[PDB]
Every structure is written in structure tokens, then in C-alpha cells.
Design a protein around this ligand. Structure first.
Ligand SMILES: *[C@@H](O)[C@@H](NC(=O)c1c(O)ccc2ccccc12)[C@@H]1N[C@@H](C(=O)O)C(C)(C)S1
Length: 416
């Protein structure tokens, strides 16, 4: 069984990430020519550390005469797996995370193909045999409060149910009683009365909370689930489902905050929203793609030992979360975020970028920075989702700055 060559794992642009090399002993040693690249995605099979990534999930494909071990080699050979990951976009994402904890996903919005997936801090496969936070895949297997990045869902629901429009005005005070508890804008900023497109661009909690309350628990949960919440996203990789409460258990105050992306509920069902970075990308992708949610995937195709395509992955939809008309309104609101609101750090001269930012507290008074977005605005070909974790540091707005940088460099790669 170790006398039979394991198949390779190769990026879409032809870079070999994992290989098996025959010994004179007869067995096969696993080699990693770019050790440290896309480590969580490539994965491993380790008694100590468990199994993860493609190594495990595609193990079969990679893995009378059966009784003779001397015939193991001559007979079968593992077929390779070609990822949708692009090595240059991957390197872009990994560089952008240097010195930070967090994660980045780049995806194609019309298919859900994953073009870059990076978690930090990371590890090399050489370190698995030494000692070895680093092992957590923060793209798919860690949950976070999404904060204001979740307002994209609240907005989409509000427009799709025909309960509001981008030009409808909202009172956006520094502080407001809702459901017997207080909702505040950041820094308690009183914004006065403003149109919703502006409350979204400036990311007012008091205004968006009012929209959430006007939607109700049933609708907010329903739309969250239509974008993927509750689903283990990934045709060919594992993602932990993003979570919302049982709407019957939610209170008005809890609903107000949930609609701003902060889970504060206390009941038998989970508090929410709690999201993955992958789910955040699927949302931006759906809005970029006319409202049609794609189930993301990371295997492009399988190759026989001699190079024949054995199978090809087909893009698959998880349904239509909002109308095309609704999606176009949310895209326009997202462009405002970057052109004149809290996402100006994502701006890149000579390309129109749209998105939505978020910030959320964790324990010890730390906090995390989020961004989802897409580009170019008029005919999107790339989506990005980012988390930069605080740790000991203030990281206000860093998600957006990383987001724009990654989008700009990935577009240039697409260009070549
Ligand atoms: C959305 O996330 C909203 N955020 C806050 O008011 C907020 C929060 O709910 C929890 C912790 C925070 C820590 C620092 C700053 C703000 C916090 C408004 N949305 C964000 C966004 O990034 O888009 C900001 C900061 C404009 S404020």
C-alpha cells in the first residue's frame, strides 16, 4: 500500500504542490516543492495532527494480485488532482497576510471556483514532524462575528422584500432604544436623517438595526440561509456551517444587533450571525452574480497517471437568494462604501472596486476587521473576503486595505 505511488496535487497554473517520490526501499516519500504554500488546502494525513485538506478529502483518487505486495507498484498508481487555485493569486494573498493573523479567499463569482485561499499563521509540512493556532484553517473552520459586513444581507433582504430602497431616509442617531436595549453608532456619531445608501456607506448601526427590525426575525434568518447559512459550503472541501438562531427564539433587541452582524442572543439555538470567511465570500459572489449563489469548489479536475482527464468539476448553484434587480441595488450600495464611505482604503486608482467593511469585538477588548468585495464593478470577475484579527493590536480598517490590494494584484494577474 506504500509501494503504490500517490498522485500529485497541482495548481491550475501548473505548479506542483505535493508529489510522491519512490525510495529504493520500495516505499514512497511525500515531497512538497513549494513547502509553505497553501498549506491548509493541500493538507496532510498525520497520526498526531489528524487529516486535513485535499490530501485527506481526495485520498482515494490520490491513493488475485492484491495478495502479492511485490506486485503493488506495477499495478495501480494514484491519479493527480488539479486545483482551481492559481499560484500567483495565492502568493498575493499569502504576502498580504505576512505579520498578521487572519484569512483571505479569492473566488470567481460566476462559478464559485476558489482561486486563492490563505490562512495565517501557517506552517510548512516540514514542521509537522517537529512540534507545531497555526493548524486552524481560518478560511473555513473558524467562526467569527461578521460585524457590519453582514449588513450586506440585511440590505439585500430589505430591498428584495420591497420594504425599503436605497433612497429611503432613515434616522441615524448616535444612540437609540430598540427592544428595550441600546443600539449605538460607532463613537456614538449622530448622523441625523440620511438615505439608506449613505447609512450603508457610513455603516450606521442605528439605521441598519431599524431595517432589521422592520424585516423581522423570520425574514432575516430566511435570507441568511438563502445565501448559505446552515450549509457546509464546498463541493470538495469542508467548511463549518455559518450559524443563525431559531427565529422563534430571537428577541427584538437581539434582532437589532444581528442585523448589524453582532450575535447577542441567549437561548437554546446558537447566537448569530457567526460566519466563516468562505461564507462571506459566497455572499459577495452572489451579489456580484445577479443573486445566484454558487457552491464553491477547489478541484478543477482529476488526471489519470498518464494525463487523461478522468473527471471535471461542474459549478453548481445553491439557488437564487435575491432577484437580479435586488443584486444590482446592493452592488451599487457596495460601490458607495468604497467610493465615499468606510471602505476608501480599498480604492485602487483606475479600477472600480465595491465592497462592505466590518469590525467586531472579541475578548480582552481585541477586535477583528473584515472586508468583502468584488471587481471590476461593471462586470465582476473576482470576489475577495478577508479577516484581519486584532490580537494585541488595533487593526481598524485593515481588512479593506488588504482587500483592495489583493483585488488589484489579482486583476493584473488575470490580465496576463
Ligand atoms: C460595524 O461593524 C460597525 N461597528 C461597530 O460599531 C463596532 C462593533 O459593533 C464592535 C467592535 C468595534 C470595534 C472597533 C470599531 C467599531 C466596532 C460600524 N462598522 C465598522 C466597519 O468596519 O464597517 C466601522 C468601524 C465603520 S463602525
Amino acid at each position: 500500500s506504500a509501494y503504490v505511488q500517490r498522485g500529485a496535487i497541482i495548481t491550475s497554473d501548473g505548479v506542483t504542490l505535493a508529489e510522491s517520490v519512490k525510495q529504493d526501499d520500495g516505499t514512497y516519500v511525500r515531497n512538497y516543492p513549494h513547502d509553505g504554500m497553501a498549506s491548509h488546502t493541500v493538507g496532510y494525513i498525520s497520526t498526531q495532527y489528524g487529516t486535513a485538506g485535499i490530501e485527506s478529502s481526495m485520498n482515494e483518487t490520490l491513493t488475485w494480485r492484491s495478495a502479492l505486495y511485490s506486485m503493488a507498484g506495477i499495478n495501480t498508481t494514484g491519479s493527480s488532482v488539479v486545483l482551481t487555485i492559481n499560484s500567483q493569486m495565492q502568493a498575493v494573498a499569502e504576502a498580504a497576510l505576512q505579520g498578521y493573523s487572519g484569512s483571505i479567499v479569492v473566488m470567481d463569482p460566476s462559478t464559485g471556483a476558489v482561486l486563492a485561499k490563505a490562512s495565517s499563521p501557517s506552517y510548512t509540512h516540514a514542521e509537522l514532524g517537529t512540534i507545531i493556532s497555526q493548524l486552524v484553517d481560518r478560511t473555513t473552520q473558524a467562526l467569527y462575528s461578521p460585524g457590519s459586513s453582514f449588513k450586506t444581507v440585511t440590505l439585500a433582504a430589505g430591498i428584495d422584500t420591497h420594504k425599503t430602497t436605497l433612497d429611503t431616509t432613515y434616522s441615524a442617531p448616535g444612540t437609540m432604544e430598540i427592544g428595550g436595549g441600546t443600539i449605538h453608532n460607532y463613537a456614538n456619531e449622530d448622523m441625523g436623517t440620511i438615505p439608506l445608501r449613505e447609512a450603508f456607506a457610513r455603516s450606521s448601526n442605528t439605521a441598519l438595526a431599524q431595517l432589521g427590525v422592520a424585516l423581522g426575525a423570520d425574514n432575516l434568518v430566511s435570507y441568511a440561509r438563502a445565501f448559505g447559512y446552515g450549509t457546509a459550503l464546498g463541493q470538495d472541501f469542508s467548511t463549518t456551517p455559518s450559524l443563525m438562531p431559531n427565529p422563534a427564539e430571537m428577541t427584538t433587541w437581539e434582532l437589532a444587533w444581528a442585523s448589524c452582524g453582532l450575535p447577542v442572543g441567549e437561548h437554546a439555538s446558537p447566537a448569530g450571525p457567526q460566519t466563516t470567511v468562505m461564507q462571506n465570500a459566497v455572499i459577495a459572489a452572489a451579489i456580484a452574480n445577479g443573486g445566484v449563489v454558487m457552491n464553491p469548489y477547489i478541484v478543477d479536475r482529476v488526471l489519470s497517471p498518464e494525463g487523461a482527464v478522468v473527471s471535471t468539476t461542474s459549478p453548481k448553484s445553491l439557488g437564487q437568494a435575491v432577484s437580479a434587480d435586488t443584486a444590482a441595488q446592493v452592488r451599487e450600495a457596495m460601490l458607495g462604501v468604497v467610493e465615499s464611505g468606510t471602505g476608501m482604503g480599498a480604492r485602487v486608482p483606475g479600477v472600480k472596486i465595491a465592497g462592505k467593511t466590518g469590525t467586531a469585538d472579541v475578548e480582552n477588548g481585541n477586535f477583528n476587521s473584515f472586508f468583502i468585495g468584488f471587481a471590476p464593478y461593471d462586470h465582476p470577475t473576482l470576489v475577495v473576503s478577508v479577516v484581519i484579527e486584532g490580537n494585541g493590536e488595533n487593526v481598524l480598517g485593515y481588512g479593506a486595505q488588504v482587500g483592495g490590494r489583493v483585488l488589484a494584484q489579482c486583476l493584473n494577474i488575470q490580465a496576463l
